[PDB]
Amino acid sequence: SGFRKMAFPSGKVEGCMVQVTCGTTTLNGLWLDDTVYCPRHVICTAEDMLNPNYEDLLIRKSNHSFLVQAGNVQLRVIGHSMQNCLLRLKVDTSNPKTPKYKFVRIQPGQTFSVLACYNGSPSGVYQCAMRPNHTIKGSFLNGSCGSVGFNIDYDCVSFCYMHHMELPTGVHAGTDLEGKFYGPFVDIQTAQAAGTDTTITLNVLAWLYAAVINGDRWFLNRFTTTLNDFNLVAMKYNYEPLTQDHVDILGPLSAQTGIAVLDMCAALKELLQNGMNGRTILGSTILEDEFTPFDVVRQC
Ligand SMILES: *C(=O)[C@H](Cc1cnc[nH]1)NC[C@@H]1C[C@H]2CCCC[C@@H]2CN1C(=O)CCNc1ccccc1
């Protein structure tokens, strides 16, 4: 019993973290086989950042402009190239701790584990959701660029996020491991806004199932609804529409608890319309939207 934010074990990813320095900037990189990936902004000076022409900045650099350190071992840079908003540095040593891995582009609403690193050194691990507005609500400080987000399936690490920046609102923006930003952002030091966020309805419902699996039942009722009248109320409270595909995804949880999806939906409508009246669900007064159905099943 019990239900916690739970990250994947981070060892496989820890063995890939290195330190990358260019001039006086030090930030993290990811060392897979004979390649190190890091934010290309590592090459910018204070002035360059404002309005960088990265192709111009990079052609001016050479292999010895980059220092890569793996623990206290220097790795020799023998090649460099641009990979959208990442640099790809080729090193003379293949990482012997390279796990089975792939690069995935995470979708809105999906979760991943973040390994926050400073100076090439892992510092903490936590779960985050890709927000509908293509930001993550992380916890990152200066020096954390290059920190990665990942999931694990069996043996295989699926890297999905590399951290670039914090927006003014205090949320975070970064790239996939092909170097393409999530969302409308650019790697310039200018104020950028994200779109208006919305709540991840599928995840809220999953969490409500988790609550029931853990014995929190007060918010259940016998009121029911159709998918359409649920959606009308969702829209009013800035919740994502719920689709039949989403309903289907909740099938196993629904079968496990004996609570039909639309009946839980009726439970959520009531929670949205009248609040909680001083009570908690899994210890929270907030409707939690960063556990997916999969995170619920895997844990409960
Ligand atoms: C990187 O580690 C940091 C991540 C962070 C900070 N708080 C939470 N996460 N982001 C660095 C930040 C943003 C990027 C955006 C793209 C262009 C470069 C820009 C550099 N950033 C700075 O804060 C720069 C601060 N001054 C500075 C000047 C010269 C060289 C390095 C840094």
UniProtKB/Swiss-Prot annotation:
It comes from Severe acute respiratory syndrome coronavirus. The lineage of its organism: Viruses, Riboviria, Orthornavirae, Pisuviricota, Pisoniviricetes. This is 3C-like proteinase nsp5. Cleaves the C-terminus of replicase polyprotein at 11 sites. Recognizes substrates containing the core sequence [ILMVF]-Q-|-[SGACN]. May cleave human NLRP1 in lung epithelial cells, thereby activating the NLRP1 inflammasome pathway. Also able to bind an ADP-ribose-1''-phosphate (ADRP). May cleave host ATP6V1G1 thereby modifying host vacuoles intracellular pH. The active site is at H41, C145. It catalyses: TSAVLQ-|-SGFRK-NH2 and SGVTFQ-|-GKFKK the two peptides corresponding to the two self-cleavage sites of the SARS 3C-like proteinase are the two most reactive peptide substrates. The enzyme exhibits a strong preference for substrates containing Gln at P1 position and Leu at P2 position. Residues 1-300 are cytoplasmic. Residues 1-300 form the Peptidase C30 domain. It is found in: Host cytoplasm; Host Golgi apparatus. Monomer. Homodimer. Only the homodimer shows catalytic activity. The gene is rep.
